[PDB]
């Protein structure tokens, strides 16, 4: 259609981050988190305007997106279910969590539900090992106890 523009409400937030640190370029990660929060992913076409706002070359921004594992340029999802697949969660029941997720949602790690609602994202240690096995739903973090318990948690995300 036309050159991609940030909705004003997103743009305002991005400008707040850019003005927060002494140098604009320091805000790059906060900006990318904001973009992913808004869109449910990093839209490829969002990077050139971001780069302009940061006064950075596009190739620099693209390299940063590629580097940082939290950012996703490929799949839009309303809720990212980050499942720890590292040592302690593995010992304590990652596989049971993944099975319960498959039973409830019909998807495996790396997949998105057909409605765009949920994506399962395998991640390294989330720093909550005493409560293994751990998962996040967007910013919220939980211990997995059982399928029934998990089902009730997922029911909170509408």
């Amino acid at each position: 259609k036309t050159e991609f523009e940030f909705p004003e409400e997103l743009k305002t937030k991005l400008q707040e981050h850019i003005n927060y640190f002494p140098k604009k370029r320091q805000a790059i990660l906060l900006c990318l988190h904001e973009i992913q929060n808004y869109y449910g992913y990093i839209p490829p076409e969002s990077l050139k305007p971001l780069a302009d706002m940061l006064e950075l070359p596009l190739n620099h921004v693209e390299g940063v997106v590629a580097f940082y594992d939290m950012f996703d340029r490929e799949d839009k999802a309303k809720y990212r279910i980050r499942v720890c697949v590292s040592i302690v969660c593995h010992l304590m029941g990652t596989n049971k969590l993944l099975k319960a997720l498959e039973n409830i949602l019909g998807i495996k790690p790396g997949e998105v539900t057909p409605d765009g609602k949920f994506k399962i994202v395998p991640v390294q240690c989330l720093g909550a090992c005493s409560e293994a096995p751990v998962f996040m739903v967007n910013d919220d973090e939980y211990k997995f106890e059982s399928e029934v318990q998990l089902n009730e948690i997922l029911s909170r995300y509408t």
């Binding site: 002494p22 370029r25 990660l29 990318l32 950075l56 390299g63 580097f67 594992d69």
Partner: peptide, 26 residues
Amino acid sequence: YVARGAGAYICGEETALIESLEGKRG
């Protein structure tokens, strides 16, 4: 100032952290 990482364990290494604070790859 509070800065946020974005998924890299290596950004806990102090020089990669600084690179990240400067708006670069870690």
